[PDB]
């Protein structure tokens, strides 16, 4: 997988691909990897799939309390601190490689976070295995302070270079645009590239074309009264 | 040492647990609060009062969010509600959003909070929170439901109810005003009217706190683009909005 | 003073009897009548709520009947609050036995377990016992249907018919004169209701103040099917017995 | 009523038990502390109740870290237990921050502990007043710690029986020096007001013990004033009250 | 927590032991008679109230071992706690020492639960008294022990505890002898039935009998058997 | 009884009353007299039996070959403090290679007693110890109050009739301090001190137990015919 | 070896329209040895169906673990558990043993009873929600299954078209797998009746 | 009946123990007055210098919790230091675990919850200090929240504490009647101090020295105290108005 997060003047955009792998076998052709720490702090997860989801869920609960405890929008940096510490006690046994993006009232932020509790900041960050492929495109076309439309193009193309040179990345491109002082627009399936070509024949079989031994009915509604 | 591990609750000799009778007295020294369940929403209302006139009541909350579609409101002591609502939020997240990954049902949440009360009548160094809560909510499994949580640590579902020191007056008012089918708009007009007879302060929308768990709002959800996902059923009404409804009585 | 404020309520009295256990039985006479009758084809549990109001929602109220497992339900007579803690301990224990032996828990074991918890409160900690009385409807295949009452001391007594709560004596005299050892669930449903009609806590007995539940072996293949009637299905049986 | 513990509280806004414990300090030995420009000179009355005693061998003066003298009055065991606790605290600070603990910092830590025992019923309130201070990089300091767990900065402090004689003459001392006196001078002034405070203890007779921490005499370390210099002060004080 | 629920007395007593024995007094009546080839514990059963299903109702005699039985008097709540604990002890003698428990071991164990709650605080002794009896493995000697809620135990040839134990005790002075216990299973059983028919009365419905025979034989005598002894003794 | 059943209350008089009651345990108990010179410390304890069928009970416990304590109060309270003193004394040898200083062991002992008087469900221990030893600072004779307080003296006593013993020691105060290097003389003067602490209890040889410690003389307890030379 | 692929076991599941289907093989062995042909991997709690692959002891311990949890839920809310809440539960319980991890792949297949929507989800070793509404595969015939399943499957099948496709996909994978083979059972799961049908398969 | 000795309810629906905590804050006789400015929040408070042998600079009732949040404390000085320490500990905790300095609103609530837990323990007596927290946050602007020994807090336009604080409330209330807004508009922080002192002088009928006052000022993103020379300049300016 590849995850880009591109910061711009009026917000930050977080984008990912939907191909989920378990080994060289592709588990899912579509699965969103965009998870929700908060409705304004979306992240996506790369690396070990099981370790990203559960840890974004655990601190998602804790940040929801924090958000209720302050009665305002949580900060992006609050999510980053909860994550950093939790990973740090394991000393990197749990491999979470997230780009954490979000808006809050002090402005736009974009961070990346690694499995040990290492943290970096920048105006574009890329993580996962297709990260290399995305980064090249980004550094040519990026200028300081993009618009929303500009940034959406840039992010979506960066994942696209992910698709032809990384095999962890594939299928559709999702974008979620978070802007300051507005709702977040999850533009799921912003680009669909590679759809399956039509099969030569339809594999349909009449009845009794596979063998059966014996059948029966088994009813699973409820224990039945008389 | 610290040998307080003996309960501070004890049976009384004519039956009944003395400590929770004492806490029930604390509910009738507190403010007034009510809930009317409509068939297309719930309205909950309470009165705001201040320790100083220099205290802001625009930063004073007595209606709190537990989960987005579920609100709470108290009568009794301020301090006792303040910690206990935090614990209500906490147990919704530890035991159903870390296990079932979603916001808990209204029925379910109300039961869990009664367990918290129940261990504050057990053991030393604790005593029950002297509040009754109304937990209005909507879930997708039992519909709208309106509950009353007791300092006993018991709950009951209701159709319309009141708590506070002016509860008896309020529920007798509501006796004639409740019907099988209600509009949310009519529910609001009854709610403010019932609370007019139980509030000795101003009756402006500044000092009357109003919140509905009416129809959901997907523009307060904080994101858009999953139609499938629904936003807060709760909506707190700010002071000007409450004034518009006072003229519409 | 960390002993100057302790009164000692885990002690016996000069009689050999615990203060708090005696008082608990009083506070359970406050809660309304709850009845168990053991026919042979099932067990009828019938309880009349201890609160009613007309703005109270009684169509979703659970305040007497609770399922511990798919063959064992209880009626509650005492505090709802006190009973709740035991109800969830019960759920854990029943399922624990199913988890390890892959067999549903017999009625005996579960009843004994909750009783130990009640005795445990008086044995140590300085804790008060939860004043609950349960009437257990339970099925096992080894004794068939089993009926039990447990009291807040933590002791269990087998029964054929029994009542706790309000008007416990009255209810019992009605059961004694009318009981057959050859009663059906039908006979026991009518007996339960008529007994609640003489031990009623308003002046009229109403369907919406009744929780009524049965456990029936009529359900096919030898299964036991617990059905907790809706008040609108309790209404049907209230017209059967002609109260209404 | 309202003294049965310390989680009782009165409608008077007082805790009675804690006020009662100040009376134990009033039954103690006289002890003084003079805040000087460049240090502090403590002095404490050590009664001779018998000629059986061994002089200047029973210290009421225990040093903490190296630069904080602590001397007390009231119940002698309770104050030695207080100072044992604070010697552990001094060591922890030195561990973590690799520097000797400051005087305001040492005061705060002691104050929390004495403050804690007037809230718990499982642990008995203190019955000591301690007078402690010293020289660190933030100046000379002098602190008096009540058994209620209160302290302040002081230009002069006293506790014990004979604080009546001591306290008054410190008002004249500030009035002598409204910009304080030398560390040298304070040797003979700490001795002098134990000898005037020997008129609330004139039933018995006493032994003078003197200690100091000052920048200009010992270099900001707490040392005992001993030998000929201790005896020079005793000769001075002895003449004043005669 | 360790806030004494057992505390010393000005008479050199402990309060909870005096109260415990009275709690054993007001409870049910147990008689224990041992022959030369049996033990018999017959006990009082509360089933006075009708509509009680006596069959599924808890017994007054519970087997702990395949030839060690235990009966009880006092609180009915407390006794069941002990009976779970004893079962653990029984499996522990097997675990570390092999062989099923000796009567004498089990007597010291019940007493050791009582003992614990006697000296320490935060606990109080159970108001329970027991008659422990049975065989040791490869012995055909009857053992009859008694435990009391103090944490004390006594060996007996016959003993009775419970209500009007003195009436029964005096009756066995004139029938039973230490010197020559009954030489038959049935004679022993009938002597215990005769003693119970004084105070408990009220047929085989309140009267129970359990017999242990030497070396791993536990048999229970049904209501019908008990009734036949009753009528013969009544007539005689 | 207002504060007398509690160990955590003051006490409008600025006391705790428990400490005065712990002091009466010394009055009902045995008597022991200590006196020291520069080069020797001496304990002479009066051992006590229950009746004639009863032998006398040792009132001197050896803590080390340079340390000893004596009880005058209740024996089970002494049994707590004696173990703790012995443990911390072996510890000093083990860790610091040091003969345990008598003064410093007194201060550790003081604060130990204190924290059980502070705690509710505790008490101040009703034993007064006179603790002798010879360390690097010479001889010491300490007085242990029930409270915890240690005072250093050339001569002191605790028990019943102790007041008369201290009268004797204040008279002969400068005599026994100026006999140095002869252990025989200090012992003889302690016999006469505790003779003023008799009420016709009489000194015999199986009542009398002496223990000394010297500059070069180990802590040794004499009984039998080793005290018969000093009567 | 790997304690997941020591006993094998495989589960296939496919969506249809107004139906779902889950199927498994009956082969359960230890290493090279076939132990039983009398072992079913499909269990059900309400209208949710749980298939579980991988290590044997973890198959059976997790089967009773999920039974423990769903009993609690059912008694509490007094309603059947939904496929969506069951996923969340499975994800959280697998993540409990992150260290000393579980060695299984649970498979969730049911029909949402509040919309009539077929619903499936997959999981592997310590967790991971595998959102798809097409198919979810697990076990040591996964290579055999993902390929087979993708080609046969067309969206919006009927309960009976779904039966022919899922039977074929299982049969050919199981027989091109060594740790599967002995027998098969197929549940065809409708909104109202569940038919359980065994397949005659070649004994491998 | 021990409902005045341990923290259990009476049949009046009130905890007496808890009420007694409010009756200790009037015994030390410290008055405080706090107003919200336009860029600052100013709190002036009494300093009692009783003797010539107390050093007035170490006499404190203003504890600086965080970089931006002062706290003024009304009631006994033992409980004051215990509260100040706790408040600081939790604020540093919040910066550490959430990666930004603790807001005033949330700090009031955190101490309120622990004070309520101290009225729920029967072996831990509540701290008898009323705590005022003054700040200027950039998320709530200038703020005052006042917590009490019960566990109740509310926001304030202005607040006062002490025995004679009812007298102060009147003056402040009139001031906000005229402006018809909930904060004083004046862009110089110095002149908001001068207004604050005017309202205190009216209420207590006493003129002040520099060592009778101790002043804390929270400006935007910093909290500091005025030294004794600086306070005298403010009291000189009262006459200039």
């Amino acid at each position: 997988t590849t995850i880009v997060g591109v910061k711009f003047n009026n917000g930050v955009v977080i984008a990912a691909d939907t191909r989920s792998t378990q080994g060289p076998i592709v588990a899912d052709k579509n699965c969103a990897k965009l998870h929700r720490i908060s409705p304004k702090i979306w992240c996506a997860g790369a690396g070990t799939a099981a370790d990203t989801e559960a840890v974004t869920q655990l601190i998602g609960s804790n940040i929801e309390l924090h958000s209720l405890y302050t009665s305002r929008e949580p900060r992006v940096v609050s999510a980053l601190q909860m994550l950093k510490q939790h990973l740090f006690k394991y000393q990197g046994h749990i491999g979470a490689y997230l780009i954490v993006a979000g808006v809050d009232p002090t402005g736009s932020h974009l961070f990346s976070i690694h499995a040990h509790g290492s943290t970096d900041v920048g105006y574009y960050l890329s993580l996962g295995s297709g990260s290399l492929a995305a980064m090249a495109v980004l550094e040519s076309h990026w200028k300081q302070d993009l618009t929303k439309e500009e940034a959406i193009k840039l992010a979506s193309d960066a994942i696209q270079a992910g698709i032809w040179n990384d095999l962890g990345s594939g299928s559709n491109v999702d974008v979620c645009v978070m802007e300051i002082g507005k709702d977040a627009e999850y533009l799921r399936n912003y680009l669909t590239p590679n759809v399956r070509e039509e099969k030569q024949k339809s594999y349909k079989f009449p009845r009794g074309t596979t063998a059966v031994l014996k059948e029966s009915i088994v009813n699973i509604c409820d224990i039945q009264e008389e | 040492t610290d040998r307080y591990s003996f309960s501070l609750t004890t049976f009384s000799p004519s039956g009944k647990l003395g400590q929770i009778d004492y806490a029930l007295t604390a509910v009738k020294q507190g403010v007034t609060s009510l809930g009317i369940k409509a068939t297309n929403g719930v309205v909950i209302a309470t009165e705001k009062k201040s320790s100083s006139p220099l205290a802001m009541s625009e930063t004073l909350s007595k209606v709190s969010l537990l989960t987005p579609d579920i609100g709470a409101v108290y009568s009794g002591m301020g301090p006792d509600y303040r910690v206990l609502v935090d614990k209500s939020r906490k147990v919704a997240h530890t035991s159903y959003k870390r296990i079932y990954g979603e916001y808990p049902p209204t029925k379910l949440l109300v039961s869990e909070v009664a367990k918290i009360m129940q261990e504050a009548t057990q053991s030393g160094g604790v005593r029950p929170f002297g509040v009754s809560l109304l937990i209005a909510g909507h879930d997708e499994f039992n519909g709208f439901s309106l509950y009353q949580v007791d300092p006993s640590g018991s709950y009951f579902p209701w159709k319309a109810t009141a708590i506070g020191k002016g509860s008896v007056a309020a529920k007798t008012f509501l006796e004639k005003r409740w019907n099988d089918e209600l509009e949310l708009e009519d529910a609001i007009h009854i709610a403010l009217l019932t609370l007019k007879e139980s509030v000795e302060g101003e009756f402006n929308g500044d000092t009357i706190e109003l919140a509905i768990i009416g129809d959901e709002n997907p523009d307060l959800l904080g994101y858009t683009g999953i139609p499938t996902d629904k936003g807060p059923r709760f909506r707190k009404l700010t002071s000007q909005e409450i004034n518009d409804r006072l003229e519409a009585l | 003073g960390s002993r100057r404020y302790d009164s000692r309520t885990t002690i016996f009295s000069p009689e050999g009897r615990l203060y708090q256990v005696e008082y608990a039985l009083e506070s359970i006479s406050h809660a309304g009548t709850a009845i168990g009758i053991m026919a042979s084809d099932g067990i009828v549990l019938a309880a009349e709520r201890k609160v009613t109001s007309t703005l109270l929602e009684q169509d979703t109220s659970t305040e007497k009947l609770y399922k511990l497992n798919d063959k064992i339900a209880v009626a509650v007579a005492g505090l709802t609050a006190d009973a709740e803690i035991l109800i969830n301990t019960a759920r854990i224990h029943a399922q624990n036995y199913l988890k390890t032996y892959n067999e549903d828990i017999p009625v005996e074991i579960l009843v004994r377990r909750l009783s130990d918890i009640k005795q445990g409160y008086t044995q140590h900690g300085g804790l008060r016992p939860f004043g609950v009385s349960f009437i257990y409807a339970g099925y096992d295949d080894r004794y068939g249907y089993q009926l039990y009452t447990s009291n807040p001391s933590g002791n269990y007594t087998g029964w054929k018919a029994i009542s706790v709560g309000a008007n416990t004596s009255a209810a019992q005299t009605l059961l004694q004169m009318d009981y057959k050892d050859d009663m059906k669930v039908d006979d026991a449903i009518e007996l339960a209701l008529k007994t609640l009609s003489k031990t009623t806590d308003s002046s009229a007995l109403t369907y919406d103040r009744l929780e009524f539940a049965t456990i029936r072996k009529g359900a096919n293949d030898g299964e036991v099917y617990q059905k907790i009637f809706k008040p609108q299905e309790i209404k049907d049986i209230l017209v059967k017995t002609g109260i209404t | 009523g309202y003294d049965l513990s310390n989680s009782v509280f009165s409608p008077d806004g007082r805790n009675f038990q804690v006020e009662y414990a100040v009376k134990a300090v009033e039954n103690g030995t006289t002890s003084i502390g003079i805040k000087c420009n460049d240090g502090v000179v403590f002095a404490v009355e050590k009664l001779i109740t018998s000629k059986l005693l061994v002089p200047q061998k029973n210290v009421k003066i225990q040093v903490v870290d190296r630069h904080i003298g602590c001397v007390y009055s009231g119940l002698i065991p309770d104050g030695r237990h207080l100072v044992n606790r604070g010697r552990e605290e001094a060591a922890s600070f030195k561990k973590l921050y690799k520097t000797p603990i400051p005087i305001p910092a040492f005061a705060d830590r002691l104050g929390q502990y004495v403050q804690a025992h007037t809230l718990y019923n499982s642990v008995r309130p203190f019955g000591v007043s301690t007078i402690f201070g010293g020289v660190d990089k933030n100046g000379a300091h002098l602190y008096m710690l009540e058994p209620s767990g209160s302290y302040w900065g002081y230009k002069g402090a006293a506790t014990g029986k004979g604080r009546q004689s001591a306290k008054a003459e410190l008002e004249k001392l500030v009035d002598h020096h409204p910009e304080g006196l030398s560390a040298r001078e304070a040797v003979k002034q700490a001795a002098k007001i134990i000898y005037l405070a020997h008129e609330d203890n004139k039933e018995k007779d006493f032994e003078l013990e003197i200690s100091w921490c000052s920048l200009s005499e010992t270099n900001g370390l707490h040392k005992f004033v001993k030998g000929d210099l201790l005896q020079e002060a005793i000769d001075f004080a002895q003449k004043e009250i005669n | 927590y360790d806030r004494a629920l057992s505390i010393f007395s000005p008479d050199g007593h402990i309060f909870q032991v005096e109260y415990a024995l009275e709690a054993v007094k007001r409870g049910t009546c147990a008689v224990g008679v041992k022959g030369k080839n049996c033990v018999v514990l017959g006990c009082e059963r509360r089933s006075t109230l009708k509509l009680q299903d006596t069959r599924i109702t808890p017994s007054k005699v519970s087997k702990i071992d395949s030839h060690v039985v235990l009966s009880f008097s006092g609180l009915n709540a407390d006794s069941r706690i002990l009976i779970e604990k004893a079962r653990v002890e029984a499996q522990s003698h097997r675990l570390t020492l092999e062989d099923p428990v000796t009567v004498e071991y089990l007597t010291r164990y019940v007493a050791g639960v009582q003992q614990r709650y006697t000296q320490s605080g935060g606990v109080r002794p159970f108001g329970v008294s027991t008659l422990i009896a049975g065989f040791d493995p490869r012995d055909d000697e009857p053992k009859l022990y008694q435990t009391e809620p103090s944490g004390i135990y006594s060996s007996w040839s016959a003993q009775t505890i419970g209500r009007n134990s003195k009436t029964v005790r005096e009756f066995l002075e004139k029938n039973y002898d230490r010197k020559e216990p009954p030489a038959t299973v049935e004679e022993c059983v009938k002597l215990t039935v005769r003693s119970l028919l004084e105070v408990v009365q009220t047929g085989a419905k309140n009267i129970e009998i359990t017999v242990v025979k030497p070396d791993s034989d536990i048999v229970a005598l049904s209501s019908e058997e008990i009734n036949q002894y009753v009528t013969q003794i009544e007539q005689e | 009884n207002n504060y007398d059943g509690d160990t955590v209350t003051f006490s409008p008089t600025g006391r705790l009353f428990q400490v005065e009651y712990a002091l009466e345990a010394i009055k009902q108990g045995s008597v022991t007299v200590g006196l020291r010179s520069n080069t020797h410390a001496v304990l002479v304890a009066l051992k006590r039996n229950a009746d004639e069928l009863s032998s006398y009970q040792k009132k001197i416990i050896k803590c080390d070959e340079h340390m000893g304590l004596s009880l005058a109060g209740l024996a089970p309270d002494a049994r707590v403090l004696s173990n703790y003193l012995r443990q911390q004394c072996n510890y000093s040898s083990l860790v610091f290679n040091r003969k345990l200083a008598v003064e410093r062991a007194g201060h550790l002992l003081c604060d130990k007693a204190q924290k059980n008087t502070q705690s509710y469900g505790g008490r101040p221990y009703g034993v007064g110890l006179l603790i002798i030893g010879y360390d690097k600072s010479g001889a010491h004779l300490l007085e242990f109050q029930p409270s915890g307080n240690v005072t250093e003296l050339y001569g002191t006593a605790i028990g019943a009739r102790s007041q008369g013993a201290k009268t004797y020691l204040e008279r002969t105060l400068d005599t026994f301090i100026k006999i140095d290097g002869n252990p025989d003389e200090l012992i003889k003067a302690g016999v006469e001190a505790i003779s003023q602490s008799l009420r016709d209890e009489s000194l015999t040889v199986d009542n009398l137990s002496i223990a000394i410690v010297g500059k070069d003389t180990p802590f040794t307890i004499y009984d039998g015919e080793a005290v018969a030379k000093y009567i | 070896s790997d304690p997941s692929s020591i006993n094998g076991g495989i589960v296939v599941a496919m969506t249809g329209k107004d139906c779902v289907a889950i199927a498994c093989d009956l082969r359960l062995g230890s290493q090279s040895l076939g132990v039983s042909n009398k072992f079913e991997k499909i269990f059900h709690y309400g209208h949710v169906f749980l298939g579980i692959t991988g290590l044997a002891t973890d198959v059976t311990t997790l089967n009773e673990m999920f039974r423990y949890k769903t009993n609690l839920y059912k008694l509490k809310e007094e309603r059947a558990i939904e496929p969506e809440t069951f996923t969340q539960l499975v994800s959280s319980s697998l993540y409990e043993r992150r260290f000393g991890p579980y060695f299984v792949g649970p498979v969730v297949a049911g029909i949402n009873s509040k919309s009539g929507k077929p619903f499936i989800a997959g999981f592997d070793l310590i967790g991971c929600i595998d959102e798809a509404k097409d198919f979810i595969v697990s076990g040591t015939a996964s290579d055999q299954l993902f390929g087979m399943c993708e080609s046969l499957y067309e969206p919006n099948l009927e309960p009976e078209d779904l039966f022919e496709t899922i039977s074929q996909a299982l049969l050919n994978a199981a027989d091109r797998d060594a740790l599967s083979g002995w027998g098969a059972v197929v549940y065809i799961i409708k909104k109202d009746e569940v038919v359980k049908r065994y397949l005659k398969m070649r004994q491998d | 009946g021990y409902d005045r000795h341990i923290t259990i309810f009476s049949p009046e629906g009130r905890l007496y123990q808890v009420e007694y905590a409010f009756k200790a804050t009037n015994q030390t006789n410290i008055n405080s007055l706090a107003v919200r400015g336009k860029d600052c929040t100013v709190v002036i408070s009494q300093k009692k210098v009783p003797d010539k042998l107390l050093d007035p600079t170490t006499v404190s009732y203003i504890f600086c919790i965080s970089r931006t949040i002062g706290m003024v404390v009304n009631g006994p000085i033992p409980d004051a230091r215990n509260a100040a320490l706790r408040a600081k500990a939790e604020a540093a905790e919040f910066r550490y675990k959430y990666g930004y300095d603790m807001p005033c609103d949330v700090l009031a609530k955190r101490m309120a919850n622990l004070s309520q837990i101290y009225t729920q323990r029967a072996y831990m007596r509540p701290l008898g200090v009323i705590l005022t927290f003054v700040s200027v946050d950039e998320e709530l602007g200038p703020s005052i929240y006042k917590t009490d020994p019960a566990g109740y807090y509310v926001g304030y336009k202005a607040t006062a504490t002490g025995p004679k604080q009812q007298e102060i409330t009147t003056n402040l209330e009139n001031h906000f009647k005229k402006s018809k807004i909930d904060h004083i508009n004046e862009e110089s922080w110095e002149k908001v101090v001068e207004f604050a002192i005017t309202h205190m002088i009216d209420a207590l009928g006493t003129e002040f020295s520099k060592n009778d006052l101790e002043v804390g000022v929270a400006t935007k993103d910093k909290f500091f105290t005025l030294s004794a020379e600086n306070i005298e300049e403010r009291l000189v300016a009262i006459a200039e108005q």
Side-chain angles (χ1 to χ4, degrees), chain C residues 148-168:
Chain C
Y148 289 103
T149 298
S150 69
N151 61 17
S153 178
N155 197 48
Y156 57 102
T157 304
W159 293 102
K160 283 174 175 304
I162 190 54
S163 172
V164 245
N167 301 337
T168 291

Side-chain angles (χ1 to χ4, degrees), chain A residues 36-40 42 56-62 64-65 68-69 71 176 182-188, chain B residues 61 65-68 86 89-90 93-94 97-101 103 218-226 229:
Chain A
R36 239 179 353 199
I37 300 233
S38 302
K40 299 244 177 123
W42 282 73
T56 51
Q57 180 186 329
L58 176 75
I59 353 209
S61 308
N62 297 76
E64 183 139 4
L65 277 175
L68 275 121
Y69 236 39
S71 307
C176 187
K182 303 84 339 311
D183 251 270
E185 313 183 24
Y186 183 8
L187 299 185
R188 193 174 181 351
Chain B
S61 283
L65 199 70
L66 299 187
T67 58
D86 286 19
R89 288 177 185 142
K90 185 184 63 55
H93 298 327
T94 49
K97 192 182 184 294
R98 293 190 197 165
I99 304 173
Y100 291 92
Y103 299 124
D219 63 29
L220 305 167
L221 176 54
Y223 63 91
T224 57
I226 298 302
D229 300 318

Side-chain angles (χ1 to χ4, degrees), chain C residues 57-111:
Chain C
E57 186 171 42
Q58 290 193 114
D59 308 273
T60 59
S61 278
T62 58
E63 55 184 84
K64 290 287 176 235
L65 277 279
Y66 302 87
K67 292 188 192 181
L68 317 174
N69 74 43
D70 69 322
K71 318 179 157 73
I72 298 176
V74 284
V76 162
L79 281 293
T80 6
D82 293 1
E84 192 60 270
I85 301 295
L86 289 141
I87 287 167
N88 289 11
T89 316
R91 291 174 171 150
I92 289 160
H93 180 55
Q95 293 163 15
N96 189 39
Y97 190 106
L98 181 60
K99 183 172 155 60
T100 55
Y101 290 105
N102 292 32
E103 193 181 74
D104 187 15
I105 196 164
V107 192
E108 169 64 251
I109 307 306
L110 183 56
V111 170

Side-chain angles (χ1 to χ4, degrees), chain D residues 156-210:
Chain D
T159 189
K161 296 183 176 278
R163 78 188 80 176
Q164 291 173 87
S165 323
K167 285 295 210 68
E169 211 290 297
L170 292 166
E171 303 181 278
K172 300 197 276 300
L173 192 63
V174 165
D175 188 39
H176 295 330
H177 308 278
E179 43 65 58
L181 78 174
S182 195
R184 205 32 170 207
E185 186 43 59
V187 190
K188 308 315 172 307
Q189 291 311 108
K192 172 181 189 297
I193 49 166
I194 300 285
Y195 260 92
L196 297 206
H198 181 52
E199 302 287 283
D200 292 333
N201 274 302
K202 44 171 171 61
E203 297 81 65
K204 311 186 171 68
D205 64 349
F206 86 109
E207 162 76 34
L208 194 65
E209 289 186 272
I210 298 193

Side-chain angles (χ1 to χ4, degrees), chain B residues 4 22 25 29 54-56 82 125, chain H residues 9 13 120-121 151 155 157-158:
Chain B
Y4 289 74
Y22 302 157
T25 68
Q29 306 306 2
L54 308 173
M56 288 163 68
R82 187 168 282 93
Chain H
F9 284 88
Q120 177 166 22
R121 303 310 177 207
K157 314 178 171 63

Side-chain angles (χ1 to χ4, degrees), chain C residues 1-4, chain F residues 6 8 120-121:
Chain C
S2 296
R3 313 177 281 189
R4 190 185 298 277
Chain F
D6 295 27
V8 73
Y120 181 50

Side-chain angles (χ1 to χ4, degrees), chain D residues 106-154:
Chain D
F106 177 73
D108 184 305
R109 291 199 181 200
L110 292 180
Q112 298 302 283
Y113 186 49
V114 169
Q115 200 279 339
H117 283 44
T118 67
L119 301 170
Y120 275 88
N121 297 344
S122 291
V123 289
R124 171 177 58 92
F126 286 85
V128 297
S129 188
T130 308
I131 311 227
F132 66 95
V135 183
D136 65 317
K137 50 190 54 66
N138 298 343
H141 288 96
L142 181 59
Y143 286 100
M144 191 171 40
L145 181 57
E146 297 298 298
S148 173
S150 312
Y151 64 87
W152 292 130
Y154 290 98

